[PDB]
Amino acid sequence: VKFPQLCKFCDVRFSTCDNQKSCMSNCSITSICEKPQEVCVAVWRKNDENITLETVCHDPKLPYHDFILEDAASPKCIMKEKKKPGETFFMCSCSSDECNDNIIF
Amino acid sequence: ALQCFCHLCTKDNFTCVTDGLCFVSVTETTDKVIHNSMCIAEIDLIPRDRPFVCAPSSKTGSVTTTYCCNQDHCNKI
Amino acid sequence: PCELLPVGVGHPVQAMLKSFTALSGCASRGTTSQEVHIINLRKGAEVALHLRPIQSLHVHQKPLVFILNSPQPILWKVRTIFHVVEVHFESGEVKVETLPHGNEHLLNWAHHRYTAVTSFSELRMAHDIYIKVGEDPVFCKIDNKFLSLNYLASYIEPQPSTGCVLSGPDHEQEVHIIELQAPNSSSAFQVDVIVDLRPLDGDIPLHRDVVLLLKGEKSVNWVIKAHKVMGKLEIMTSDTVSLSEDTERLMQVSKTVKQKLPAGSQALIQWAEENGFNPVTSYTNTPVANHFNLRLRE
Amino acid sequence: ALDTNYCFRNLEENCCVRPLYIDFEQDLGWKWVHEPKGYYANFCSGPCPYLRSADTTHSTVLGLYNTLNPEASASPCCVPQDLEPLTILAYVGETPKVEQLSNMVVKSCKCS
Amino acid sequence: ALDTNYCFRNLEENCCVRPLYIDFRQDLGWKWVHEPKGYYANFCSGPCPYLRSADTTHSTVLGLYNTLNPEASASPCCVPQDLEPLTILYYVGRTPKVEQLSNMVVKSCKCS
């Protein structure tokens, strides 16, 4: 029986996280994903001078920010840099409990 | 209703009828292999969305593999 | 107060007293010299007789001699030699002979055709008799104050009881209150009290929700024996409960927590009302009993 | 369940029913019980590891707690689940009374 | 009864309720519990001498048996009598769920 996963689920939050290899999401909500097929997602955005981190539960058979989840099976959340206009955009996904809490660059 | 393997159900060919889920767990002691199979009732599955008893329960030292399923006589692994 | 007005036939709860009687008897180890068992029945027709040892070898190969005297023709339902005054087995020996109705002459009536009696029992009038197969080597002198667990006779006398019926069956949950006062004449501690749940008709099973408030002065242990009734069973009691295997299988038994219930009809009715058991169907207040036959209506 | 059927045919270190015969006069000094002279009362013994026949949620939690923190000495304990009555024969003065004493013999255990 | 009022205020070596706080993540590894982070579950500990809060007749017999035959090591055990529920909060997606988990905190013990 596939059971829902534990993911950090704080939606979009501000972050003082950059110029570091590893980094904690500092999210205070560990949530049970509403659907068993969902996986943990972390997305890193540094628009101009303001950094923002987002943690959600998300179905991998579905696009997030119009991107296809490539690593919806990996244990840890290793960020991969996507290209978005005028912005530094990173995103990762993983299939471990609270795996998007510790974020690897 | 679900039919699970039960290693204590001597009277009933080692089987119980459950409203929740079938359970099985193999613990690795360095001198014996423990095979616990039982029924878990719906009210004892907390939280129902992610029962902890089924949750990953492999801590340091014990190679414990806990499975939960909802097919009849599925906890035979 | 509901607790002071007598009940009649049309009451769901009928108080009974189960007992095990014997007037006199003896006990001996005759096998050393077939075992002779004598039952001297009296007047208060069919009687049931059960045979069972402590079951050392689990098989009984000595033919027994049973002398079933009675001042009444009685059909002896032997349940798994029979000197008699008919016997049925759902290796017999059916003999009809004039038996003496005095116990001392009956005891030596067996001594004339046999060596030495193994057990003598004088019973008053029971439909069920439970009798020995084995042989205690410790010990045939008959005594007025003799009793052995092996030789016993069961009788169930109805007991008087007060109480009242408050609500009819036009409800979703038939809640019955039972207030016992003394379970047995002799009071040691923690004796069994069977509550028997059955439908009134006794033909088709019943899906009913049943609440049972069971309160007693003396500490009893309630034993719920549900027959042909399935559904929700709520038990609230100041004492402990026990459940037959059929009860848990047929019904969903909710459990008490040994509540500190109040005393009296109006108080116990109030408690049940202030706890989700509305409306109360019946209240019963038996002064002394150890068996209840509850019949449900729908 | 951890009843006499399972517990008596399986060499179990953990919580299980154990056989015990108690002679009323020799073991308890109870002359007042005439028949029988003794009975198999049984008892519950053995450690209660995680998920072994947990009575309540609190006993699943403590069994899990004591798994990771064994030193705490706060674990569930082996306890009779289902008991059965014993019919005895005792004399009140000179009247022999046949009384059925409820909850006398342990037939199954649990971890509470 | 051997409840928290008596057991926590008056020192008793015998069977009594003992205070215990269990941290969900530190003591059990329960990442899924949001509020609270832990709770006072308590537990029952201590020897069960004769007649000390005996649950059933079998525990009066065993408590008396183990008094006269202490070497047998077959005595009643200290066990929760009345437990009370604990209300917790956990997240299913973005939804905070308030669940009252019954039989979580022991408030009185007995000898069984």
Automatic annotation (TrEMBL), chain C:
Source domain of life: Eukaryota
Compartments (UniProt record): Cell membrane; Secreted
Name used for this protein in its record: Transforming growth factor beta receptor III
Organism of origin: Danio rerio
Residues of the whole record sequence present: 30 to 359 of 848
